[PDB]
């Protein structure tokens, strides 16, 4: 129609006319808004005037008019200003949209205002009118009593004080409800908020809020202490564990903390235990001995290892390149990992007599992979072969120390010192390549043992090997300073290292200091930004390669857009063949948590020009999709496996195997072909040395740890990060001048195990367990929805998929005290009748005491 | 509200992937010209 | 090419193992093997080649001017190229050429416009 | 061997600007210290993209012609485009029969 | 509530952008690779034409080549 | 339950289509029930998906019979019915999205725009023009043609001949679906014929012979001849006879607007010519047009841009240039700029398909 009548009266210019035209105007603004728009100047003028009487109604109309144009922020200013005639406990479709826009606006001011001062929130200092709406929106959702909607908003508008109050008031212990809400908010804050300063604040508070309830969920409480990685958080927790003291629970908690936590963290945790005088039990756990021994006991019984596969593999190839000899020494170690059996190597000795220097060192270092899992029988086995004792070459004696450093990583306290005495000794001797190979293992070992704490004593020792400038040994020392100082480096250490790359004129020392520089910034995030630039600002190829690993490591875990943009950007815009391959490798580490997304980012790149790029995407998937069995990862890796370019075949074969470890025929139809393929390649002569290296080691992955391990970059037992594993794979992924360095895969094996542990017998039941996943769609390889009733036993192969449907039997002779929890990792029992065994076994810590 | 956060991560990753494809095609047009000169 | 002869106690100590190269070294003691070709040069060289390859900048102005002079002929031949082009597409009903043929013509005009 | 080791208007104008600018600075200095033809052809000659103005008359006629040539090329790209649409159209059609 | 719906649109839109770009990306990518194969071929000394005189049952063949003299050569395993 | 609610919606739509002229007896008698099915927020209730199983064309047919003062029969004299309906369609637009759900969006703007054109103002029109512009890949061939048909009428009033000329030509393209071989085509055709006359002249009716009835064709021939001869007397008579058509279209203004073009055309036909031009010869020509205003009409001509010439009235002779020679007037440059747009715009859409 027309609004021209209504507007005519507005121009008459008195109080009555203003009010009548206003109350008319409110009703049909929306349809006739066009006509009214031209009088919007009078309306705004009436706004901040009061020569009339219509102000709050004028602001109201103006909001409606602005709205219909498509100026939402403009409307929002006036909707607020309408004041008493605008209410958010009254909704129309109109109301919904400008409240939505008012929050956005509020979000914008809050992002800026947090960065500026991190207690902006402790007062109003932002627009009062906005703040008012904001508190009231929070109240609305919460009166209706759905707490996920209210908490979502409070996050978004970057203020902490609302989060605290909101949750607090509705914690009414039900107990089921308090626990579940808090567990949701924890998961949320980690995965979706990389505003690192904000995220920590929410984590420390959500921890104290759960802790204060009389009922807690102790699994969730461990997550958050690992993440913030504080001894101080640990201490508060444990004194709370003193008040409700149970030996079963307190023991479980220590079996969790020892694996996940860092070396230094572990160290202050023994100190605080010693000084609190609470449990001498727990301090032994904190030394790591119990968990590793329990796995040994498991791997010895459930091993399925075959030397006939290694035999077949060796006879399938022909020697003519020392790369094959490495391949089978290494596939053997991996296969026979943890089972303490050297069996193959014991069987075949004439080939050993052939082997070059590096190949000898590797053969020796294979014992280390097998004998990991013993921190007291680890040292013992290697004693007849050390420097000063028997051997047959000094390369063999050098690999003895490399293999010791493999094992005793994660509790290198003794071994660092022990190795240091060998470093200082052999710095004089460099006259023979026999000593360079000895001092080369020596440097690897020490770097590996001293990881996660940072001892400057080791750094200063490995550095004088650089000044003496020995060609093999300088590579191990350089990489070794990076391993030792990981995530705990000096700023000074960065600067000294950085200058020395430039100084060094041996290719290997230059290569090792590049990679060396990437490691030392692990977990820094934005704090590494200064060094990223510096590595890329060096116009050396080695240093630009080295820069890419530095983002992957620093920004690891939960992904960060800025970090991916920079890496993809180098990958596209740099044409250097090392550089493009390293920046693709690097995406997989960032993206370990969000692994679904990696086949799409790398989709393109896998079918993209230049083989180094294609190589880099194989690795990306291999690291990122390891253990999950992502169907999308495998589909991308299939073409690449029979690619012309030999090292592309190789890396795809390594990659396939890491994802599909402990996944079988029937579960996946595709793996039979894959295993066939691995085998066929060794046997044909038409493949080249690099392709068969890929193939041999790939068999070795699938069949690793007697078929009972998976490769993961975290624990299942807390579901929180595991450092060692991440670090292992980045050294593993490179082999190009790094022909012996395969061995770093020992640190990435995690056993796939659900075993029960008696609380006071420390033994494993053998009993029948129930399961609903279909067994015989699980099989013994080589040599789908479920709810159907089924059975499994104890001390048999628990697969990833299986673990979810298993349940402890409750009613023989034990109580399982906190029960099973729908993920891998042990659960401590506390016994009804320890004094008769059900069908226990003796563990290996009771074979060597 | 929680949901949106999940979805924003997928959107962002994708957005970068799209810009990166555009850039790659640029290096290829360049590569083509250079390769014709060499042949 | 670059080749050197083999030495014992080095190229067996460094790069089953290598049965082949092991019987070769206990045997002949010396035999040809190929060494890789690489380059190394400094940044100083690299910068100050690409201002030679003054002649290039001043030469670039001169070239633009004299190109507009010759454009009378260069005009006429693209007119011809196009007549062939259209005729070709008819006969088929080739397409590839035509596209390449279309792209080239676009590049040349961008250049003709730039000149003037 | 050189090539194996190794494997616009504005840049020239900026150089031009810097020379003139330097030349002025010199002339001021030179008067001060002291208390033809080349400079004289470097001012009037260019006063009238500047030179290219006078030429523009002749350029324009040929400029239509070379524009028409680019237009035929655009049509040609559309023609090639239509085939791509059909290729996609065929695939879809076969997938529906199946 | 309005805000969630808007995020769902922009995703749907983005994927179509990915689909279009991906299809073109492939066409260029192929062309470089095609040119490289062609370059490997364009490095050759040619093949000689000959006439099979007679085949020997031990996997030699006697050939008179027109380029050269007469030669004994090793029968191919591709034929 | 879910399946049953979707079914419920299909049944109301279906019922609503049936009770019209299309598939049932007379639309007016039936109107009240058709209106009961719309009205008490069952249309609202439909929001399972977007409106595209019921269409603007349909909402148009029910509402026009309800109210237009010629089918209603001055049933009421208020646009009370349309005001609620326009508001409700406006209310839909807010919650409508544009990016992937503009099936409902274009249809609602079509219904609203239509009502302004039926009875409203040309002032408020501007906002509705800007809102309208949304992809033309989402709406049917039938629906695209109607959207263009209304847009083109609106553009004519503003005197944007050119824009309407493009939309109309695109509108009536092919016929894979009906209302581009029916009555709707004839309505489009009349409006196209008018827009070309407005630009200057229409001198082709080849297409129109076959897609319009004889009754239309005669008035099309009479107009084109009047305008071509330049003769005002024939043109006026053409309006006079086909008064019923000009009224019918609801746009007697066209007659007023076109008549000015005819007198302008007459002055043009005999160009500028020789370097001096005799008064008498031009006077003769202007006498035809209007014969007691020779000097005024010629003055009006120059200011307007019909002609450009230079006059002395102390000599009473006319001086001119005669230009038939087309030197550059930014004319290559213009071609190039246009082509870069033409290639990119076309190029992107073709590529998506």
From Swiss-Prot, chain B:
Q: Which family does it belong to?
A: Belongs to the AAA ATPase family.
Gene name of the record: RPT3
Subcellular localization: Cytoplasm; Nucleus
Q: What does this protein do?
A: The 26S proteasome is involved in the ATP-dependent degradation of ubiquitinated proteins. The regulatory (or ATPase) complex confers ATP dependency and substrate specificity to the 26S complex.
Q: How is it modified after translation?
A: N-acetylated by NAT3.
Q: What is this protein called?
A: 26S proteasome regulatory subunit 6B homolog
From Swiss-Prot, chain C:
Source taxon at top rank:
Eukaryota
The record describes its post-translational modification as:
N-acetylated by NAT3.
Coiled coil segments of this chain? none
Into which family does the record put it?
Belongs to the peptidase M67A family.
Q: How does the annotation summarize its subunit structure?
A: Component of the lid subcomplex of the 19S proteasome regulatory particle complex (also named PA700 complex). The 26S proteasome consists of a 20S proteasome core and two 19S regulatory subunits. Interacts directly with RPN8 and STS1.
Record's comment describing the protein's domains: The JAMM motif is required for the deubiquitination and degradation of ubiquitinated substrates.
What job does this protein perform? Component of the lid subcomplex of the 26S proteasome, a multiprotein complex involved in the ATP-dependent degradation of ubiquitinated proteins. RPN11 is the only catalytically active member of the lid and serves as the essential deubiquitinase of the proteasome.
Other comments on record: Present with 16400 molecules/cell in log phase SD medium.
What is this protein identified as? Ubiquitin carboxyl-terminal hydrolase RPN11
Q: Which organism is it from?
A: Saccharomyces cerevisiae (strain ATCC 204508 / S288c)
**Underlying gene:** RPN11
From Swiss-Prot, chain E:
- The protein, known as: 26S proteasome regulatory subunit 8 homolog
PTMs per UniProt: N-acetylated by NAT1.
Q: Which family does it belong to?
A: Belongs to the AAA ATPase family.
| Subunit structure as annotated in this protein's UniProt entry | May form a homodimer or a heterodimer with a related family member. Interacts with OLA1, TMA17, and UBR1.
Q: Which purpose does this protein serve, as stated in its record?
A: The 26S proteasome is involved in the ATP-dependent degradation of ubiquitinated proteins. The regulatory (or ATPase) complex confers ATP dependency and substrate specificity to the 26S complex.
Q: In the UniProt entry for this protein, what further remark is given in the free-text comments?
A: Present with 4700 molecules/cell in log phase SD medium.
- Protein location: Cytoplasm; Nucleus
Species the sequence originates in: Saccharomyces cerevisiae (strain ATCC 204508 / S288c)
UniProtKB/Swiss-Prot annotation, chain F:
Task: Explain the post-translational modification.
Answer: N-acetylated by NAT1.
GO terms for MF:
enzyme regulator activity
- Any idea where the PCI domain is? 145-325
The cellular component terms of Gene Ontology attached to this UniProt record, alphabetical and capped at eight, are: proteasome complex; proteasome regulatory particle, lid subcomplex
| Modification type Phosphoserine: residues | 329
Which key words tag this protein in UniProt?
A: Acetylation, Phosphoprotein, Proteasome
Is Phosphoprotein a UniProt keyword of this protein? yes
Q: Which example biological process does GO assign this protein? A: regulation of protein catabolic process
The family assignment reads: Belongs to the proteasome subunit S3 family.
What role does this protein play?
Acts as a regulatory subunit of the 26S proteasome which is involved in the ATP-dependent degradation of ubiquitinated proteins.
The record's misc note reads: Present with 16700 molecules/cell in log phase SD medium.
Subunit annotation: The 26S proteasome is composed of a core protease, known as the 20S proteasome, capped at one or both ends by the 19S regulatory complex (RC). The RC is composed of at least 18 different subunits in two subcomplexes, the base and the lid, which form the portions proximal and distal to the 20S proteolytic core, respectively.
Please state what the protein is called: 26S proteasome regulatory subunit RPN3
Provenance organism: Saccharomyces cerevisiae (strain ATCC 204508 / S288c) (Baker's yeast)
| Full protein stretch here | 126 to 478 of 523
């Amino acid at each position: 129609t027309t609004a021209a009548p209504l507007l005519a009266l507005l121009r008459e210019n008195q109080d009555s006319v203003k009010t009548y035209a206003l109350e008319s105007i409110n009703n049909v603004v929306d349809q006739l808004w066009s006509e009214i728009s031209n009088e919007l100047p009078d309306i705004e003028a009436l706004y901040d005037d009061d020569t009339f009487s219509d102000r709050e109604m004028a602001a109201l109309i103006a909001s409606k008019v602005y709205y219909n144009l498509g100026e939402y922020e403009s409307a929002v200013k006036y909707a607020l200003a309408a004041k008493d005639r605008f209410d958010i406990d009254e909704k129309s479709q109109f109301v919904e949209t400008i409240v939505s826009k008012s929050i956005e606006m509020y979000v914008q001011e809050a992002s800026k205002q947090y960065t500026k001062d991190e207690q902006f929130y402790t007062k109003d200092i932002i627009d009062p009118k906005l703040t008012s709406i904001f508190e009231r929106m929070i109240e609305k959702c919460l009166k209706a009593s759905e707490l996920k909607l209210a908490l979502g908003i409070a996050l978004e508008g970057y203020r902490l004080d609302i989060i605290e109050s909101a949750l607090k008031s509705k914690l009414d212990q039900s107990t089921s409800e308090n626990v579940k809400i808090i567990n949701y908010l924890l998961t949320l804050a980690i995965t979706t908020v990389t505003n690192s300063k904000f995220r920590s604040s929410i984590l420390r508070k959500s921890f104290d809020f759960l802790m204060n309830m009389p009922n807690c969920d102790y699994l969730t409480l461990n997550k958050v202490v690992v993440n913030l990685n504080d001894a101080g958080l640990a201490l508060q927790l444990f004194k709370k564990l003193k008040e409700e003291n149970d030996e079963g629970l307190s023991a479980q908690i220590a079996f969790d903390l020892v694996s996940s936590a860092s070396q230094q963290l572990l160290e202050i945790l023994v100190t605080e235990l010693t000084a609190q005088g609470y449990d001498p039990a727990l301090l032994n756990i904190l030394s790591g001995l119990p968990t590793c021994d329990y796995y040994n006991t498991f791997l010895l019984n459930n091993k399925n290892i075959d030397i006939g596969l290694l035999n077949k593999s060796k006879s399938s190839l022909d020697g003519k390149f020392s790369l094959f000899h490495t391949a089978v020494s290494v596939a053997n170690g991996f296969m026979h990992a943890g089972t303490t059996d050297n069996s193959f190597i014991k069987a075949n000795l004439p080939w050993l007599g052939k082997a070059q220097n590096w190949a000898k060192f590797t053969a020796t270092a294979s014992l280390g992979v097998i004998h990991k899992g013993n921190l007291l029988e680890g040292k013992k086995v290697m004693a007849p072969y050390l420097p000063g004792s028997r051997a047959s070459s000094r390369f063999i004696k050098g690999g003895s120390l490399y293999g010791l450093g493999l094992i005793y990583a994660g509790f290198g306290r003794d071994t660092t010192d022990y190795l240091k005495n060998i470093i200082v000794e052999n710095s004089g001797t460099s006259g023979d390549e026999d000593v360079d190979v000895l001092l080369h293992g020596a440097s690897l070992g020490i770097g590996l043992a001293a990881m996660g704490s940072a001892n400057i004593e080791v750094y200063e020792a490995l550095k004088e090997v650089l000044y003496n400038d020995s060609a093999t040994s300088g590579e191990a020392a350089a990489l070794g300073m990076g391993l030792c100082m990981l995530g705990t480096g000096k700023p000074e250490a960065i600067h000294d290292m950085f200058t020395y790359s430039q100084e060094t004129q041996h290719g290997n020392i230059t290569r090792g200091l590049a990679v060396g520089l990437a490691l030392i910034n692990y977990g820094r995030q934005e704090l590494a930004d200064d060094l990223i630039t510096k590595m890329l600002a060096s116009d050396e190829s080695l240093l630009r390669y080295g820069g890419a690993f530095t983002i992957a490591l620093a920004y690891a875990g939960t992904g960060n857009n800025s970090a991916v943009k920079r890496l993809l950007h180098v990958a596209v815009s740099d044409s250097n063949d090392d550089v493009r391959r390293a920046a693709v490798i690097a995406l997989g580490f960032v993206l370990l948590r969000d692994y679904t997304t990696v086949p799409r980012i790398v989709q393109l790149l896998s079918k993209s020009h230049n083989a180094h790029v294609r190589c880099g995407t194989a690795f990306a998937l291999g690291i990122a999709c390891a253990g999950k069995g992502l169907q999308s990862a495998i589909d991308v890796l299939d073409p690449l496996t029979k690619d012309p370019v030999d090292f592309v075949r190789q890396a795809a074969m390594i990659a396939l195997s890491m994802i599909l470890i402990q996944q079988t025929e029937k579960l996946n139809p595709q793996v039979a072909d894959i295993n066939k393929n691995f085998l066929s390649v060794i046997t044909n002569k038409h493949q080249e040395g690099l392709a068969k290296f890929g193939a041999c080691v790939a068999q070795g992955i699938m069949n690793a740890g007697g078929r009972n391990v998976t490769i993961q970059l975290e624990n299942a037992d807390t579901g929180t990060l595991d450092t060692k594993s991440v670090v292992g794979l980045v050294m593993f992924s490179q082999f190009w001048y790094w022909f012996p360095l395969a061995h770093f895969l020992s640190l990435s094996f995690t056993p796939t195990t659900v075993i029960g542990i008696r609380g006071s017998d420390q033994a494993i039941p053998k009993f029948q367990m129930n399961c609903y996943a279909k067994e015989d769609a699980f099989s013994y390889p080589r040599m789908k929805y479920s709810s159907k009733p089924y059975k499994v036993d104890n001390m048999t192969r628990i697969l990833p998929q299986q673990s979810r449907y298993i349940s402890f039997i409750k009613d023989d002779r034990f109580v399982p005290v906190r029960k099973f929890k729908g993920n891998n990792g042990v659960v401590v029992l506390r016994d009804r009748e320890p004094k008769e065994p059900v069908a226990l076994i003796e563990t290996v810590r009771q074979m060597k005491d | 509200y929680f949901k949106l956060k999940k979805l924003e991560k997928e959107y962002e990753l994708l957005t970068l992937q799209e810009d990166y494809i555009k850039d790659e095609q640029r290096h290829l047009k360049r590569e083509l010209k250079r390769a014709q000169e060499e042949v | 090419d670059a080749f050197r002869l083999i030495d014992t106690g080095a190229l067996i100590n460094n790069l089953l193992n290598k049965a082949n190269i092991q019987a070769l070294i206990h045997g002949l003691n010396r035999h040809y093997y190929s060494l890789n070709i690489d380059y190394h040069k400094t940044a100083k060289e690299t910068k100050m080649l690409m201002n030679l390859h003054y002649e290039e900048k001043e030469e670039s102005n001169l070239a633009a001017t004299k190109s507009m002079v010759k454009i009378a002929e260069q005009y006429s031949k693209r007119i011809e190229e196009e007549k062939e082009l259209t005729e070709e597409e008819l006969k088929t009903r080739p397409k590839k050429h035509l596209s390449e043929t279309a792209d080239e013509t676009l590049e040349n005009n961008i250049v003709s416009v730039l000149t003037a | 061997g050189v090539e194996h080791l190794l494997r616009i208007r504005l840049t020239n104008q900026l150089k031009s600007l810097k020379g003139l600018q330097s030349k002025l600075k010199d002339v001021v200095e030179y008067l001060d210290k002291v208390i033809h033809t080349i400079l004289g052809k470097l001012q009037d000659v260019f006063n009238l993209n500047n030179l290219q103005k006078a030429l523009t008359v002749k350029t324009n006629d040929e400029l239509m012609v070379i524009y028409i040539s680019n237009l035929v090329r655009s049509i040609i790209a559309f023609d090639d485009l239509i085939e791509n649409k059909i290729q996609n159209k065929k695939i879809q059609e076969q997938r529906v029969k199946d | 509530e309005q805000k969630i719906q808007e995020t769902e649109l922009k995703i749907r839109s983005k994927t179509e952008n990915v689909r279009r770009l991906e299809a073109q990306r492939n066409a260029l990518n192929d062309k470089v690779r095609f040119i490289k194969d062609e370059l490997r071929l364009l490095q050759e000394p040619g093949s000689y034409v000959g006439e099979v005189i007679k085949i020997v049952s031990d996997k030699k063949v006697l050939v008179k080549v027109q380029p050269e003299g007469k030669y004994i050569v090793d029968v191919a395993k591709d034929i | 339950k879910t399946i049953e609610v979707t079914a419920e919606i299909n049944c109301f739509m279906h019922l609503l289509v049936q009770l019209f002229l299309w598939d049932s007896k007379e639309l007016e008698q039936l109107v009240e029930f058709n209106r009961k099915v719309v009205i008490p927020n069952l249309l609202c209730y439909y929001n399972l998906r977007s409106l595209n199983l019921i269409n603007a064309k349909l909402w148009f047919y029910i509402y026009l019979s309800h109210e237009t003062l010629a089918r209603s029969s001055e049933e009421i004299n208020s646009d009370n019915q349309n005001i609620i309906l326009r508001s409700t369609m406006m209310k839909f637009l807010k919650i409508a999205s544009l990016k992937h759900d503009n099936e409902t969006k274009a249809m609602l703007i079509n219904l609203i725009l239509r009502d302004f054109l039926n009875n409203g103002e040309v002032d408020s029109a501007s906002d509705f023009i800007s809102k309208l512009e949304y992809p033309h890949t989402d709406v049917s061939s039938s629906l695209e043609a109607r959207y263009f048909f209304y847009l083109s009428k609106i553009n004519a009033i503003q005197l944007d001949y050119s824009t309407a000329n493009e939309y109309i030509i695109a509108a009536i393209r092919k016929a894979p679906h009906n209302s581009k071989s029916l009555g709707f085509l004839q309505q489009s055709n009349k409006l196209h014929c008018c827009i070309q006359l407005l630009m200057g002249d229409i001198p082709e009716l080849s297409f129109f012979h076959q897609s319009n009835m004889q009754k239309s064709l005669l008035p099309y021939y009479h107009l084109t001849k009047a305008v071509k001869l330049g003769d005002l007397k024939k043109f006026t008579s053409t309006i006079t006879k086909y008064k019923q058509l000009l009224l019918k279209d609801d746009t007697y203004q066209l007659c007023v607007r076109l008549r000015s073009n005819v007198i302008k055309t007459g002055i043009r036909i005999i160009s500028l010519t020789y370097k001096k031009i005799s008064l008498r010869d031009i006077c003769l020509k202007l006498n035809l047009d209007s014969e007691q205003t020779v000097e005024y009409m010629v003055s009006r001509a120059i200011r307007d841009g019909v002609i450009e010439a230079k006059i002395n009235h102390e000599d009473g002779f006319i001086e001119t240039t005669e230009l038939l020679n087309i030197y550059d007037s930014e004319d290559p440059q213009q071609v190039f700029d246009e082509r870069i747009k033409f290639a990119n715009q076309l190029h992107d859409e073709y590529l998506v398909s």
